[PDB]
Design a protein around this ligand. Structure first.
Ligand SMILES: CNc1nc(Cl)nc2c1ncn2Cc1cccc(OC)c1
Length: 164
């Protein structure tokens, strides 16, 4: 069903994450972690303290798709188990470094063709696929976008609800 998913998304905040490569999204799916640039790290930390759920919606550049979505379970933390991100040209490991723990809600893909009817008020009402890494998605658009994804029957939202 979709009832527990709707409960997790209630009064949530949503952020578009743009990854330059599939390898980083795969590593985030396997390890339950994400790292971003300091400007976005600051926005996510503020959002985490502000809302019952902060949802990251992932898209790999040039893929034409979203690759799933996850809920922050922590603020960013440094030190600890390092992460072998694939870094773009211009990208050093120091610029990442802050690591958020995340709980996946859906690891399934959604093609942009299916979200063409959803516009983001916080990005000039452009289609929600359009946006820089870290762009916030308004509540109603973000909720409807997450509800478009195919159900991921491998995930049990009971433990996610308990984190709240
Ligand atoms: C593990 N985290 C990430 N991995 C990857 Cl491959 N791309 C990311 C990540 N976070 C944000 N982006 C987008 C990006 C890429 C290169 C230069 C940027 O300067 C604005 C922005």
């Amino acid at each position: 069903g979709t009832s527990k998913l709707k409960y997790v998304l209630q009064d949530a905040r949503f952020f578009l994450i743009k990854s330059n490569n599939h390898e980083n999204v795969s590593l985030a799916k396997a390890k339950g972690v994400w790292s971003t640039l300091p400007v976005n790290e600051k926005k996510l930390n503020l959002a985490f303290r502000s809302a019952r759920s902060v949802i990251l919606i992932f898209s790999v550049r040039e893929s034409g798709k979203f690759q799933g979505f996850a809920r922050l379970s922590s603020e960013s933390h440094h030190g600890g188990s390092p992460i072998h991100w694939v870094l773009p040209a211009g990208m050093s490991a120091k610029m990442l470094g802050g690591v958020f723990k995340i709980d996946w809600i859906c690891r399934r893909e959604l093609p942009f063709t299916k979200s063409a009817h959803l516009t983001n008020p916080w990005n000039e009402h452009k289609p929600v696929k359009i946006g820089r890494d870290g762009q916030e998605i308004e509540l109603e658009c973000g909720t409807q976008l997450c509800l478009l994804f195919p159900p991921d029957e491998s995930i049990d939202l009971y433990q996610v609800i308990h984190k709240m």
